[PDB]
Amino acid sequence: TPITGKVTAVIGAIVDVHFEQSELPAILNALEIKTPQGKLVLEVAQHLGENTVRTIAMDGTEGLVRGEKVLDTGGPISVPVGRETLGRIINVIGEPIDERGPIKSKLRKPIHADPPSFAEQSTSAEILETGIKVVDLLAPYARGGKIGLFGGAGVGKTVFIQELINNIAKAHGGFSVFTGVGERTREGNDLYREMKETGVINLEGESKVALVFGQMNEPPGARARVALTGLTIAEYFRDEEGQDVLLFIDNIFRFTQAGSEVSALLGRIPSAVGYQPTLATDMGLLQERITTTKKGSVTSVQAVYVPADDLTDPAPATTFAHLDATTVLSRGISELGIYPAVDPLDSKSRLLDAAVVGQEHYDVASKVQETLQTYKSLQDIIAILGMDELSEQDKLTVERARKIQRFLSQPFAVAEVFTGIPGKLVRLKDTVASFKAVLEGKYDNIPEHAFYMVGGIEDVVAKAEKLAA
């Protein structure tokens, strides 16, 4: 309903309204303050009573007079959804920023949506292939699986997500949703250009990819509801349309950080170190809003930034609950000259427990993990003295484990340029074969340079030819 108000205060970027009549809105309703600038959309988070609410600000609060009108839309901020959301870029107020005008829609929906219940559940967990070696072996993707990557940008957080799109999105077909939660401006423009160049999106033709991008000059309340805006679009596809979809998310640390900034202001006492008290409920909603239904099925890949590389920090910890597979990428490994930078000892998938990836694949991956863990154990002794001041058996073990570490480097294919080595696309089926041979000593007799930046089995042979000459 229409509810007039005036802006009593603007304390931080958590404005307080004082309504001029006895009608009052519910919590999570949306309000607009009229200025010759545009609008500011703010969203009720508390009622502090005496007809004074406190509202989250999705627009910077510059130039706000006290005693200035506000109006009530009468519900939560409404995005536009449809199959005419494709080829588009959507911000957070449901308005384009790629300027193709008014976003054609049949239903406009509230950004908050009550999560899918535990009666709509697909039991699916079928293998989907990444086309990256490390990933196929250590933590192969799944139809129901949720993957997350942690640690700070090494190879570039974004860039990894680009390879994933290059490989998985041209062989999964159908719809894909990208939601970038307070992601850097320049990077979105480069991707938009690439999709049209590679004929995925076209604004003159079809668009089987849809897009949501925010901006990291936007205020904290806004960057927090970039995530929800994409998520509304995703549900529409999964359910109403019933299509199987992807999701990619980069950077979802930024959701948590945006929440932590507003947490203080609202009138909350936060948790230790600084993070929000509502972290568990809120993280719960997002990851139960991406939960498979018995219509379509989805697979998600999420990027998390750590400002210390400490996954025991409270925000990376809560992520872990909602993940059944991970592919941690560590800064250390990038610095050493290994791309990709996957840590191999902090990898997991749910299907890697048993013969859920087949017995042969499980034997090869089980032994790989053992060899590298021994290599990590003998790291001190190697540093302190060396390997010839160890036992003869051990010396082989160390040398074998040194070929494995190097072997894992696969050249990127939409970042071939950046690595500087022409990309290798190494199959799930091939990765099992290549790794089998290497464990039995069949390529462990030729240089540690014939393992430096190689793909499958064939390439190892070919880098020997080079070195010889």
The residues in 115-174 that bind another protein, with binding defined as CB under 8 A, are 115-119, 121, 123, 125, 144, 146
Does 184 qualify as catalytic in the annotation? yes
79 marked among binding-site residues:
no
151 marked among binding-site residues:
yes
- In angstroms, what is the minimal distance from the CB of 340 to another protein? 22
131 marked among binding-site residues:
no
Pick from 136, 261, 343, 459 the residue near another protein by CB under 8 A.
261
Set 157, 238, 254, 424: catalytic member? 157
| Distance in angstroms (rounded) separating the CA atoms of residues 249 and 289 | 14
67 marked among binding-site residues:
no
Residues contacting 224, CB < 8 A, separation 6+: 56, 181, 255, 258, 259, 262
278 marked among binding-site residues:
no
- In angstroms, what is the minimal distance from the CB of 377 to another protein? 13
Pick from 167, 257, 299, 410 the residue near another protein by CB under 8 A.
257
Within residues 30-89, the interface with another protein by CB under 8 A covers 60, 62, 89
Pick from 317, 396, 461, 462 the residue near another protein by CB under 8 A.
317
Question: By C-alpha distance, which of 258, 298, 285 is closest to 112?
Answer: 285
* Residue (274 or 441) nearer to another protein, CB: 274
User: Is 112 one of the binding residues for another protein (CB under 8 A)?
Assistant: no
User: Is 324 one of the binding residues for another protein (CB under 8 A)?
Assistant: yes
* Residue (262 or 426) nearer to another protein, CB: 262
Set 32, 43, 163, 183: catalytic member? 183
User: Is 447 one of the binding residues for another protein (CB under 8 A)?
Assistant: no
Pick from 5, 188, 423, 455 the residue near another protein by CB under 8 A.
188
User: Is 110 one of the binding residues for another protein (CB under 8 A)?
Assistant: no
Set 6, 69, 184, 196: catalytic member? 184
Pick from 16, 68, 129, 288 the residue near another protein by CB under 8 A.
288
For every residue of the chain, which 3-state class applies, written as one string? CCCCEEEEEEECCEEEEEECCCCCCCCCCEEEEEECCEEEEEEEEEECCCCEEEEEECCCCCCCCCCCEEEECCCCCEEEECCCCECCEECCCCCECCCCCCCCCCEEEECCCCCCCCCCCCCCCCECCCCCHHHHHHCCCECCCEEEECCCCCCCHHHHHHHHHHHHCCCCCCCCEEEECCCCHHHHHHHHHHHHHCCCECCCCCECCEEEECCCCCCHHHHHCHHHHHHHHHHHHHHHHCCCEEEEECCCHHHHHHHHHHHHHHCCCCCHHHCCCCHHHHHHHHHCCCCCCCCCCEEEEEECCCCCCCCCCHHHHHHHHHCCCEEEECHHHHHCCCCCCEEEEEEECHHHCCCCCCHHHHHHHHHHHHHHHHHHHCHHHHHHCCCCCCCHHHHHHHHHHHHHHHHCCCCCCCCHHHHCCCCCCCCHHHHHHHHHHHHCCCCCCCCCCCCCCCCCHHHHHHHHHHHHC
Q: Using CB under 8 A as the criterion, what x/- string covers residues 209-228 for binding another protein?
A: ----x-xxxxxx--------
Pick from 166, 167, 291, 327 the residue near another protein by CB under 8 A.
291
157 marked among binding-site residues:
yes
User: Is 400 one of the binding residues for another protein (CB under 8 A)?
Assistant: no
Pick from 190, 240, 448, 458 the residue near another protein by CB under 8 A.
190
How crowded is residue 164: how many other Cβ atoms within 10 Å of its Cβ?
22
Interface segment toward another protein; rule CB under 8 A; list 130-138, 269-277, 406-414, 453-461: 269-277
* Residue (190 or 360) nearer to another protein, CB: 190
60 marked among binding-site residues:
no
- In angstroms, what is the minimal distance from the CB of 171 to another protein? 24
Within residues 332-391, the interface with another protein by CB under 8 A covers 348, 350, 353-354, 381, 383-391
Does 193 qualify as catalytic in the annotation? no
How crowded is residue 217: how many other Cβ atoms within 10 Å of its Cβ?
10
- In angstroms, what is the minimal distance from the CB of 309 to another protein? 12
214 marked among binding-site residues:
no
How many residues of this chain bind another protein (CB under 8 A)?
Answer: 82
User: Is 262 one of the binding residues for another protein (CB under 8 A)?
Assistant: yes
Question: By C-alpha distance, which of 91, 40, 98, 108 is closest to 215?
Answer: 91
Q: Which amino acids are annotated as binding site for ATP, given as ranges? A: 151-158
The set of catalytic residues is: 157, 183-184
